[PDB]
């Protein structure tokens, strides 16, 4: 249930939003999700995970609070 719900979640999100989320989770869980994204997002997210030059400390745990939201186990 932790897998399926995260996917429904990121399918809607921005290619840059989806990117950052998969970079904080370990690559296993992340790519397990990256395998449930469509054709375009699989590539569009992936090439943007390449260009994660620097991330913002406030925006991440603001996503961690948009996490803790609607999936049971974190």
């Amino acid at each position: 249930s932790h897998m399926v719900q995260l996917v429904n979640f990121l399918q809607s999100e921005h290619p840059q939003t989806i990117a950052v989320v998969l970079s904080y989770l370990d690559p296993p869980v992340a790519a397990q999700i990256l395998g449930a994204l469509p054709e375009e997002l699989q590539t569009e997210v992936l090439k943007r995970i390449a260009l994660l030059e620097r991330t913002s400390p406030e925006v991440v745990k603001e996503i961690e609070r948009n996490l803790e939201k609607k999936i049971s186990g974190f």
Binding site: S12, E13, H14, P15, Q16, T17, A19, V20, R48, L51, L52, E53, R54, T55, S56, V59, E62, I63, N66, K69
Partner: protein, 183 residues
Amino acid sequence: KFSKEQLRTFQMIHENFGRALSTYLSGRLRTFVDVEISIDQLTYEEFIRSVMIPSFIVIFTGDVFEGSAIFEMRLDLFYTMLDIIMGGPGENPPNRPPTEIETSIMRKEVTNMLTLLAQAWSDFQYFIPSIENVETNPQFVQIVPPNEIVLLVTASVSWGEFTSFINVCWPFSLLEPLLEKLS
């Protein structure tokens, strides 16, 4: 409606806000941005149509404010920012209603942004702006009677080649408690 002298004072109340908006987002777009303000008088329907569907619409008020004002941001600019603050280049802006995350991030931004407006108004009326409600559809808002005249603030945001609009809506119910005028 308004006077010939009231339109002039209102140009110097979106003064600083023109320049403060300028150096604020440029500080968060990590590049130079120029901003220009054009002011006008419109009916409340002349404005509610000139907002594309959908769009990012924030309605707000103040402590000393009896009423409600609109903070409008076109969607092309909206997603352009969301990208930059999440390690992006400035993508192609998808024209869709935003998700939970994407507003929660930007509400904090339109909050810090709206405060800048209030820092130009501290000369005439001090107020802490708190956002009442958020909406994405302009045919769903309609705060005051559809034909009540409005102070419309058009902020021309532009950089590089791209260009967009920030709009703030002051409807005649207004500072009519403060139209026993400041000056």
